[PDB]
C-alpha cells in the first residue's frame, strides 16, 4: 500500500509544549504554552505537508496558504486522536506536558470548545476509526479550506483533493462508513472556527491579559486568520 506507506512514514512524532507544570493553572500561563505549542506543531506540520504525495505540485504560495488556513483543524483533529489513543478521551492531550483536565478546560476560558474537542475525541472510539483511516482523513483536512475566490492554481489543488478523497475511499474498500467519516471531517470545521475566533480576540487583547504569542503566530493570526473570520476563506464541507 504505497500511499499509506508514505503517510505512516511522514507522521510527526511527539511535540512538547515546554509547559511549567509546577506553576498554577492560570489563564495567562496555559494560554502562553498553548501558543508556544501551536508554533511547535506548525513547524512539524510544514515538514509533514511538504512531504505529502503531490503537495509540491501546488504553486508555492498556495502551499503556504493552505497550511496556514488548515493548521487549526489539523491540530484539533490530531489532538482528538492523541486524546483517544492515550487517555481514552478522558482528558485533552495537547502534549505530554500539557494535558487538560476539566479544571484546565475551565481555567483556559476555552471550556465550550474543549467540550466539543472531547466529543470529537470520543467519536474516534464511537466510530472505531482505524489508524489508517485517521491518517488519510488528516491528510484530507489539509485540502479542506480555501479562498472563496480560489487559489493561484486552483486546478492543481482540485486534482490533489480529488486524489486524497479517492485514497480515503480505497482505504475504506461501507457507503455508511464514508457518510460517517465525511461527517466526522465536517465536524472539525466549526470547532476550528470557534478556536480561530477565540485566538483572534485573545491576540487583540493579549497585552491586557499578559498572554505571550510567538511572532510568527501573531502574524498568522493578524494576516491569515481574519480572511477566515471575514468569510474570504471558507471550509469545503462535504454535507
Amino acid at each position: 500500500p504505497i500511499f499509506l506507506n508514505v503517510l505512516e512514514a511522514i507522521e510527526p512524532g511527539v511535540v512538547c509544549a515546554g509547559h511549567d507544570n509546577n506553576q498554577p493553572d492560570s489563564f495567562a500561563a496555559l494560554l502562553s504554552s498553548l501558543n508556544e505549542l501551536g508554533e511547535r506543531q506548525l513547524v512539524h506540520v510544514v515538514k509533514w505537508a511538504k512531504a505529502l504525495p503531490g503537495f509540491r505540485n501546488l504553486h508555492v504560495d498556495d502551499q503556504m496558504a493552505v497550511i496556514q488556513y488548515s493548521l487549526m483543524g489539523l491540530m484539533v483533529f490530531a489532538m482528538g486522536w492523541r486524546s483517544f489513543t492515550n487517555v481514552n478521551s478522558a482528558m485533552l492531550y495537547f502534549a505530554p506536558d500539557l494535558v487538560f483536565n476539566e479544571y484546565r478546560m475551565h481555567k483556559s476560558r476555552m471550556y465550550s470548545q474543549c467540550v466539543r474537542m472531547r466529543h470529537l475525541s470520543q467519536e474516534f472510539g464511537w466510530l472505531q476509526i482505524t489508524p489508517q483511516e485517521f491518517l488519510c482523513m488528516k491528510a484530507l483536512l489539509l485540502f479542506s479550506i480555501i479562498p472563496v475566490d480560489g487559489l493561484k492554481n486552483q486546478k492543481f489543488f482540485d486534482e490533489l483533493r480529488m486524489n486524497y478523497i479517492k485514497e480515503l475511499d480505497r482505504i475504506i474498500a461501507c457507503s455508511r462508513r464514508f457518510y460517517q467519516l465525511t461527517k466526522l471531517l465536517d465536524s472539525v470545521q466549526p470547532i476550528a472556527r470557534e478556536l480561530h475566533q477565540f485566538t483572534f480576540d485573545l491576540l487583540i487583547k493579549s497585552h491586557m491579559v499578559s498572554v505571550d504569542f510567538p511572532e510568527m503566530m501573531a502574524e498568522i493570526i493578524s494576516v491569515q486568520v481574519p480572511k477566515i473570520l471575514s468569510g474570504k476563506v471558507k471550509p469545503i464541507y462535504f454535507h
Binding site: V46, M64, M216, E219
Partner: peptide, 8 residues
C-alpha cells in the same frame, strides 16, 4: 517578506 514565507 512575511515571517511564515521566510520560515517556509
Amino acid at each position: 517578506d512575511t515571517l511564515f514565507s521566510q520560515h517556509y
